[PDB]
From a paper:
[name] subunits comprise an ABC ATPase “head” and a “hinge” dimerization domain connected by a 49 nm coiled-coil “arm. Here, we elucidate the architecture of prokaryotic [name] dimers by high-throughput cysteine cross-linking and crystallography.
These large distances are incompatible with their efficient cross-linking by BMOE, implying that cysteine cross-linking takes place on [name] dimers with disengaged heads. To convert the rod-shaped into the ATP-engaged state, we need two operations: the sliding of [name] heads toward each other along an axis connecting the two ATP-binding pockets by about 10 Å and the tilting of one [name] head relative to the other head by about 85° around a similar axis.
Numbering used by the authors:
A (entry chain D): 178 to 190, 198 to 206, 211 to 228, 230 to 242
B (entry chain B): 1 to 24, 26 to 50, 58 to 132, 135 to 198, 990 to 993, 995 to 1065, 1067 to 1068, 1070 to 1178
C (entry chain A): 1 to 15, 17 to 49, 57 to 59, 61 to 109, 111 to 129, 134 to 135, 137 to 203, 991 to 1065, ...
D (entry chain C): 176 to 207, 211 to 246
Write the structure that this text describes.
């Protein structure tokens, strides 16, 4: 819950999912997987490529 | 058959055309409502078996539309020609059209119903190399005489079974024949009896051909001797893998596998007595004891007849905070000779995974796929 | 019924341990094999993995099989939720290696004693994965899970016994009829005045039944008026909370719960649609989980039971919705006592009490707790 | 991680019994959420017959003694 919104407000100050990273990259992605499910986006060229928010 | 990628269109939750790239461990994440445990329904759909067949196609969310055309593809590296085909990039697709019409296609050519079975009969993408959700303990709770065949297709002995079955039918038909013609051979001034030379020409030659099918068919029926031998060779090969795999899941375990009677055709019984317990039954195991043991028995199989790519629907679902991490270790030490597809919500296996395809669901009842590597 | 303590000797993995259930959530944590699921099976064998003697410890190295297994439960009856005046109730059950028993407040009692006393913690306890047990069950077999929640089972069972009695009453009037038909011809010395000396009083003697039975049938008919009414009064109060819990779990997801036919036997049929028309068989492992879970916390809004136990009810849902089955378990900590057995730390964070169960000493389970 | 404190605590709980002999006190072994996992590990090692703990009653101060 806390890690799932600690980057939510930080998404209004667009960049890659790795731009929100410093090992815990897993959990960070897992949160973005929910926010998508809440309609709040996700861009990628193709599989396992640059992922922009 | 090194897995390459999988494309889905119109399949269940999958509405927009999306695919997944697989590596040599791939953890399929995503929160509930999404499509991760669906992708496995598609992987079994590709090779073989919601309600009926219509519920396979995207029913449609009332934020998008209602599609009526569903199809799945699979691409594999057959460099070593794992299968009886000479292609080095194989593409297998199955289609479902709302007309009630299914299709099958490989490269440029349509395929038959009972065709894609045979291409895979020797490989064993075994549907039992797919661990299902709420099925992780299936083999442990299932009756002995319902756990025998999993070894049969593990040893590869299924193809021989189809052989001896069809041959059995043939030998029956020919027996009916020779029996029926023996009755014709038994039913059989001066002028010209010239038809008897043909009667004895339609028997002494004809019963010679049929009776040449006898001794030739019962030798292919004796090829089941090879099927039973190879089976038991494997039945025993799994044996001394249990304890050593068990004892490395339960520090100090003792378990073993054994059969009933002799007369393939029998049943198998599992025995498990964890360290510092024993003296008990299978029904008296814990909730995650059955989980790990089944895991050991379906993790040791792949040390004997390994497959290319296996499926895990929530295998570590009911397990500890540690006996998952050990399950993760094992997923890493076996990820070499086979590709692993795991569906897990706990970070434990995710840390020991190579690349994750996280499944989201945006646009209402539609699944999206995002992948990341380590 | 306020849970106070639980003592165990000889029951499965139980090696003589006492559990002091605190106010709020108690998380029953630990790794596999500990036997924390026994802590629910004992709260079965005391209220009402074997088959008999399978309930008793049998076999572990560094120990020996026992012969007698017993469990006690200490309940604070200060508010008199029980039909006794005691402020500390203590119920115990036991089984002997010989197959032979229960005590109420340090005193022996009959078989249907504890049963009659609690009338109650079924769907009050959720064992491993049994959650979905509500959904998959047929609609005709689903209303049972409501009948207990509506207390209709008391009036119901009684009424059944009362009809059973009416059957015997008719069974007596049967013979009485033939007897009297013989007395009509036997009617028309003074010793024949001895035969009419039984029929005239046997008239008000058979009429004694021909009245009491009529006093019983009415006692059935309007007794269903207090069952068939209470079933609806509860059903609707759970209705108006289905949407509340369900939606609070799925932001934007709206669903409902309806029934079929009058009532008696009304198959309750369940419907759900996440935020998308989802036959509910097509719901995810979590979507099948947070349904019987929301439905619970709606029932827990109508007739909330003080002792409610759940065994790994959250092992099927992503960490995003584990917080759901965590906070809806952190609110109701005040209104009712929740004992959950889940190794997922997400709920173990808000749990007021942590009772860690391990197993030392071979197949023998010890207990620790901190909070 | 979860497995890392399992054996990371195995140094401070075995060397405290080799320094003072005093059992590792969970009240003393408190690192800092954390009081859940850190209890879960010790509440694991008991199945490996690697550690034993005593309680005169429930809810009492717990002391970890690794050995067997
Ligand atoms: N045939 C279908 N047509 C339309 N929607 C479907 C279909 N099958 C599944 N869905 C949608 O997908 C959801 C459940 O799909 P599942 O495949 O069981 O989910 P899941 O894969 O178990 O998700 P997780 O997170 O991986 S557990 C339902 O809410 C539906 O909205
Ligand atoms: N009746 C019994 N007699 C002897 N040992 C038992 C008995 N019941 C359980 N055990 C022991 O405890 C183990 C399993 O007990 P369970 O109660 O099923 O454990 P569990 O509570 O389900 O564990 P978890 O972690 O909660 S999933 C067995 O391997 C035995 O060692
Ligand atoms: Co009083
Ligand atoms: Mg799933
Ligand atoms: Mg359990």
């Amino acid at each position: 819950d806390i890690p799932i919104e600690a980057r939510m407000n930080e998404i209004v100050h667009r960049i890659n999912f790795m731009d929100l990273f410093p090992e815990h990259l897993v959990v960070t992605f897992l949160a973005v997987l929910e926010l998508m499910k809440n309609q709040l986006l996700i861009e990628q060229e193709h599989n396992f490529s640059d992922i922009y928010i | 058959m090194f897995l390459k990628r999988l494309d889905v269109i119109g399949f269940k939750s999958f509405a927009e055309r999306i695919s997944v790239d697989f590596v040599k461990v791939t953890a399929v994440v995503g929160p509930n409502g999404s499509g991760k445990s669906n992708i496995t329904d598609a992987i079994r759909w590709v090779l073989g078996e919601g309600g009926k067949m219509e519920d396979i196609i995207f029913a449609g969310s009332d934020s998008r539309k209602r599609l009526n055309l569903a199809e799945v593809t699979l691409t594999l590296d057959n460099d070593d020609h794992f299968l009886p085909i000479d292609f080095h990039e194989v593409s297998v697709t199955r289609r479902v059209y709302r007309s009630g019409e299914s299709e099958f296609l490989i490269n440029n050519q349509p395929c038959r119903l009972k065709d894609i079975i045979d291409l895979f009969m020797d490989s064993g993408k075994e549907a039992f190399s797919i661990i299902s959700q709420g099925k992780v303990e299936e083999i442990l709770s299932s009756k002995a005489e319902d756990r025998r065949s999993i070894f049969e297709e593990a040893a590869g002995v299924l193809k021989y079974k189809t052989r001896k079955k069809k041959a059995e039918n043939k030998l029956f038909e020919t027996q009916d024949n020779l029996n029926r013609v023996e009755d014709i051979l038994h039913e059989l001034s001066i002028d010209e009896e010239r038809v008897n030379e043909r009667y004895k020409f339609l028997s002494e030659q004809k019963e010679d051909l049929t009776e040449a099918k006898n001794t030739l068919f019962q030798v292919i029926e004796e090829m089941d001797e090879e099927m039973t031998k190879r089976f038991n060779d494997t039945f025993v090969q799994i044996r001394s893998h249990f304890d050593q795999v068990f004892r490395s899941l339960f520090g100090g375990g003792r378990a073993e596998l054994r059969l009933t009677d002799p007369n393939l055709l029998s049943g198998v019984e599992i025995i498990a007595q964890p360290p510092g317990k024993k003296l008990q039954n299978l029904n008296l195991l814990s909730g995650g004891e059955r989980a790990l043991t089944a895991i050991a028995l379906l993790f040791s199989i792949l040390k004997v007849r390994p497959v290319p790519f296996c499926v895990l629907d929530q295998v570590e679902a009911a397990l500890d905070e540690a006996n998952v991490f050990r399950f993760a270790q094992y997923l890493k030490k076996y990820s070499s000779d086979t590709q692993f597809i795991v569906i897990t919500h706990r970070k434990g296996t995710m840390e020991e995974a190579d690349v994750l395809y996280g499944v989201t669901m945006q646009e209402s009842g539609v699944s999206k796929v995002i992948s990341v590597k380590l």
